[PDB]
Design a protein around this ligand. Structure first.
Ligand SMILES: Cc1c2c(c(O)c3c(O)cccc13)C(=O)[C@]1(O)C(=O)C(C(N)=O)=C(O)[C@@H](N(C)C)[C@@H]1C2
Ligand SMILES: Cc1c2c(c(O)c3c(O)cccc13)C(=O)[C@]1(O)C(=O)C(C(N)=O)=C(O)[C@@H](N(C)C)[C@@H]1C2
Ligand SMILES: [Cl-]
Ligand SMILES: [Cl-]
Ligand SMILES: [Cl-]
Ligand SMILES: [Cl-]
Ligand SMILES: [Cl-]
Ligand SMILES: [Cl-]
Ligand SMILES: [Cl-]
Ligand SMILES: [Cl-]
Ligand SMILES: [Cl-]
Ligand SMILES: [Cl-]
Ligand SMILES: [Mg+2]
Ligand SMILES: [Mg+2]
Lengths: 198, 198
């Protein structure tokens, strides 16, 4: 079939959903595209190259709160951005694992730059803006990974028994959103303290 | 060589450091132990069984702040526990990935129960105690994974360039510890608010 970048990525994302990240291979991608492997090689050199591109395209396609709204608070931007990021990672099987280890791509430079600049325009030093952004990303990635890897993996004292019931009651969104608010408020307490002991 | 549980786990942890999680296989474990695979099978049924045990034993061996000190504040316990947890996951290659997806083992029941009870004894509902514990775990796992998966994976606008320099300056501990304080303070703001709008 068609082997331009867009179609190769379409097919690879479909495959990712079928196989997961560990089970995703260039060989299976070739088959899905109805081609021989040396034909695929011209287009996609190896799995790493493929994963790198998927990590970019999953956000490009499904992560639509990359930028603050006009006038939006930094609190609200981090919240909306974290929720968007979470949703995008959850959209494909092992999506968080696909993201893990990556760095912003040239195609994301202006987007991530803008976010860093935005934090600095709201009173954060680059450093603290970065630490806030990173903490949100890590918290979000950790939460999604827990959800996704638990699924893949598929007596009790009483609190643990009930804790496990609480976690088996929804997908993880409640715990995530509750933690997200704690995180953001913590950033605000820090930002507002300036040089005061806090 | 010797094939009691302790020695199999010793060998598998050494192998994990050599190969990483994806590259860890029962076949390579057999070789490292100088045995045939059907001999290993008697002892270890598959990779999943092996990973499950490694996840338990890495904490049992190296995660020594499982429990609060007498009189310790919940703030301090979460801090110490998160740092201990982080250190233990970092001790082996892909250690965070080994942990991911697991649930407490029967051998950890009393430990995790105690932590849940402890939170409840300091004013948290089981729910909120759990959400605090989970958020800490997810934040910690996300931070470690970022560090570990970045390593495995191994023009710029100016803030991104500097951000990347800041991140290439240390291992991730600074950003982690800064985020951890934000998280814990956020939990405290929530706990203290009770039914007040906050
Ligand atoms: C600033 C930054 C970001 C990310 C990132 O990986 C990163 C890094 O690896 C080193 C230095 C800086 C950054 C994100 O992955 C990303 O997910 C992302 O690409 C991104 C995006 N493209 O919209 C985001 O929404 C950001 N958000 C989750 C906090 C975050 C921004
Ligand atoms: C309470 C709990 C915990 C963990 C956990 O996975 C879990 C779960 O999957 C479902 C319900 C409850 C829990 C931890 O992994 C663990 O890492 C852990 O086993 C653990 C331990 N064994 O000491 C901890 O230190 C805890 N800490 C990182 C917050 C945390 C406790
Ligand atoms: Cl073509
Ligand atoms: Cl194209
Ligand atoms: Cl492959
Ligand atoms: Cl706002
Ligand atoms: Cl990452
Ligand atoms: Cl023996
Ligand atoms: Cl033994
Ligand atoms: Cl295997
Ligand atoms: Cl204390
Ligand atoms: Cl997990
Ligand atoms: Mg990233
Ligand atoms: Mg766990």
């Amino acid at each position: 079939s068609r082997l331009n970048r867009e179609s190769v990525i379409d097919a690879a994302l479909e495959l990712l959903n079928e196989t997961g990240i560990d089970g995703l291979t260039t060989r299976k991608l070739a088959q899905k595209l109805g081609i021989e492997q040396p034909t695929l090689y011209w287009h996609v050199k190896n799995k790493r190259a493929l994963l790198d591109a998927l990590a970019v395209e999953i956000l490009a396609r499904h992560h639509d709160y990359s930028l603050p709204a006009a006038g939006e608070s930094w609190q609200s931007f981090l919240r909306n951005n974290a929720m968007s990021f979470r949703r995008a990672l959850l959209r494909y099987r092992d999506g968080a694992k696909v993201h893990l280890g990556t760095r912003p791509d040239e195609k994301q430079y202006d987007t991530v730059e803008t976010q860093l600049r935005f934090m600095t325009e709201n009173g954060f030093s680059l450093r603290d803006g970065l630490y806030a952004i990173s903490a949100v990303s890590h918290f979000t990635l950790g939460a999604v990974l827990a959800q996704q890897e638990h699924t893949a993996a598929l007596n009790l004292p009483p609190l643990l028994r009930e804790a496990l019931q609480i976690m088996d009651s929804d997908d993880g969104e409640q715990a995530f959103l509750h933690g997200l608010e704690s995180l953001i408020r913590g950033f605000e307490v820090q930002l507002t303290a300036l040089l005061q002991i806090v």
